[PDB]
Structure 1
Amino acid sequence: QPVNQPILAAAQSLHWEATKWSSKGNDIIAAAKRMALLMAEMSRLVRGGSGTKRALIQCAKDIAKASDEVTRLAKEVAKQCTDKRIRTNLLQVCERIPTISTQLKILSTVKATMLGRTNISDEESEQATEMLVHNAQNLMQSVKETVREAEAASIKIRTDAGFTLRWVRKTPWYQ
């Protein structure tokens, strides 16, 4: 009850996928790991405490900043990619993430402002939490799918490609 469980589970789900790989030479992995860590912080932040109001807003801003890095790099991976099927799939997912993370910023600010205000009912409070939780699950899922496809895409690369990512296997774990 102290820490939201469905937010922590979503963060955990992405952490498991991202920790299948090394961050070295791979930004997408590094940013996805930062995102999973921040989303676990978010599950504590949702239950407001003095000084959590500014932290809730900043945590969502950091999550959105890390998701822009994932989006930006995955778009670069996809354009070079020779397989149309993979290239198209990767581009749809990359496109979705900015919208989801923009919504995370809105809902976090709404939740934080509310915490700051004593009057709101337990219903409005629970509902603002459930909207945040839904967004968090959607975000974690989208990034996880983006990781998978960016790796699949990596196998096929343009001979003349400007940059490459490193995909080295590591033993995954949960935070």
Structure 2
Amino acid sequence: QPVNQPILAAAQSLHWEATKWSSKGNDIIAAAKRMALLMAEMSRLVRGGSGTKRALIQCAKDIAKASDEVTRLAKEVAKQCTDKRIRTNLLQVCERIPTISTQLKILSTVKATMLGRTNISDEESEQATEMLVHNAQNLMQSVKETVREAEAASIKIRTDAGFTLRWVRKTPW
């Protein structure tokens, strides 16, 4: 029942952004929603005492897989974008995500191995937790920025080229 509040808040931050749009014809939106949902599960798992070890590692694996989908798709959009200013801005963020999510897998495994066990101090334990939480905030923020910029980039899409990603806002009606 206990939940690591900053991870849950980072997850809700991403969710608030992703749910501004429909997933229909929008994978970036679908993957971002999945990440937000998985990251909320992560806050339960880090704060949960047992059985977390297998689930903590799998949750990080799921989140990293969803991030590769976000990165892969956001890179195509940058490619089809005429505005260099937006194209350049989107690409760096897309590039950073794989590094952050690779780090999520490492830190989740570290936190998972160091659990239940009384060998390590409460200091090393909290630190492992804080490293994980920091990575989670960074990841949530990077995907949120990627969602916002990918939408901004769609406006400038090369005229009549390939297939675009559909941006429909659900806030109205």
Q: TM-score with structure 1 length normalisation? A: 0.95
**Larger displacement relative to structure 2 (112-121 or 97-106):** 112-121
Change (3 A) 1:126 1:65: same
Bigger relative contact order (CA 8 A; separation at least 6): 1
* Alpha-carbon shift at residue 76 of structure 1 (Å): 0.1
* Alpha-carbon shift at residue 52 of structure 1 (Å): 1.4
- Structure 2 unaligned segments of length 5 or more: list them: none
| Deviation by residue 1:90-123 (Cα, 9 ceiling, x = unmatched) | 0010010000000000000000011153322111
Percent identity, aligned pairs only, is 100
Corresponding residue number in structure 2 for 1:161 = 161
| Deviation by residue 1:43-63 (Cα, 9 ceiling, x = unmatched) | 011024332110000000000
- CA distance in 1 between partners of 2:122 and 2:132 (Å): 15
- CA distance in 2 between partners of 1:97 and 1:134 (Å): 14
Q: Map residues 1-175 of structure 1 onto 2, 5 A cutoff.
A: 2-171=2-171
Residue correspondences, number: 173
Question: Contact 1:48 / 1:115 at 8 angstroms: preserved in 2?
Answer: no
- CA distance in 2 between partners of 1:172 and 1:120 (Å): 52
Coordinate RMSD, CA, aligned: 1.7
Q: TM-score with structure 2 length normalisation? A: 0.96
* Alpha-carbon shift at residue 17 of structure 1 (Å): 0.3
**Larger displacement relative to structure 2 (89-98 or 153-162):** 153-162
* Alpha-carbon shift at residue 160 of structure 1 (Å): 4.4
- CA distance in 1 between partners of 2:48 and 2:33 (Å): 24
